[PDB]
Amino acid sequence: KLKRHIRSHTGERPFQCSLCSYASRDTYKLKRHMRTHSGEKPYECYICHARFTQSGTMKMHILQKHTENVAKFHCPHCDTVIARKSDLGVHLRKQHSYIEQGKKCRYCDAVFHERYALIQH
DNA sequence: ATTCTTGTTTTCATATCCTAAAATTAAAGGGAAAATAAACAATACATAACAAAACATATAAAAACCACCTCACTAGCGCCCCCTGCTGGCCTCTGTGGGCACTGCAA
Ligand SMILES: [Zn+2]
Ligand SMILES: [Zn+2]
Ligand SMILES: [Zn+2]
Ligand SMILES: [Zn+2]
C-alpha cells in the first residue's frame, strides 16, 4: 500500500495502456480503463436495465433515479437547490469563483468581480 | 900290569801316609713366643616366590552435537471495491439579437 502511495507524490505511472496514452498508478485503474476499449460491462443496474461503463456511475444512477427522500445540497451564496455535489462544484467554479480582471454590466458602468453579482445586477 | 866304563845292591832322605789328641763346629734337642691357618658361627646380600596394586581395554551409559522437519513470520503482488474530485458533453431555462406591426403626436 505504501509503495503504491509514493506514486501519489512522485508521479510514477508504471502501467501503460497499450491502446492509448493513458497510464495509471496501479493495476486496478488500468483494468478499469480496459473496459472502455474492450467494451466489456460486468455490472448491471437491476431496476431500469440502463447500460453503464462503471459501477460507481451505476450507484449514482440508482441514487439519483430510483431512490426517494435523498438529501440535496444548497449553494451557500445563492438560493438555488441542486441534486449532485459535483454539480455544486461546477456551480461554484463557473458562477461564484473570483474573476480577476472583472466583468462590467452590459447596461451601466458598474464593474463586478463575481459572475453571480453580475447576473443578479 | 895299569887304567877306564857299566851294572847292580845299600843306605840316607825326603816326601807321604797313618794315628791320635785337641777343638770345634755344626747338628740336634728342647722352651717358648709369634703366627698363619682353619673350623665354626654370624651377618649381610641376593634371589625367588607370593600376593596385591596399578595399568589398560572394553563397553555401555548417559549425553552431547548436528541436521531435518515443521509451524509460524516476512515479503510479495494482485484483487476489489470505495470514495472523492475533476472533466467533457448535454440540455433547457433564461437571455441576447432582431424583424416588424403598432401607436401617439403633431402637422
Ligand atoms: Zn486506452
Ligand atoms: Zn437505474
Ligand atoms: Zn450558487
Ligand atoms: Zn447595469
DSSP string, chain A: -HHHHHHHHH-----B-TTSS-B-SSHHHHHHHHHHHH-------TTT----S-HHHHHHHHHHHS--S---EE-SSSS-EES-HHHHHHHHHHHSSEEEEEEE-SSSS-EEEEHHHHHH-
Q: Is the CB of A51 under 7 A from strand B?
A: no
Q: How many whole angstroms separate alpha carbon A47 and alpha carbon A24?
A: 32
Neighbouring residues of A88: CB distance < 8 A, sequence distance ≥ 6? A73, A75, A82
How many angstroms is it from A59 CA to the middle of ligand 2?
Answer: 8
Resolution (A): 6.5
* Residue A32 grid coordinates: 478499469
Q: Is the CB of A90 under 7 A from strand B?
A: yes
* Residue A19 grid coordinates: 491502446
Q: How many whole angstroms separate alpha carbon A38 and alpha carbon A43?
A: 15
Q: Judge contact between A25 and A8, C-beta under 8 A.
A: yes
Q: How many whole angstroms separate alpha carbon A41 and alpha carbon A70?
A: 27
Structural method: cryo-EM
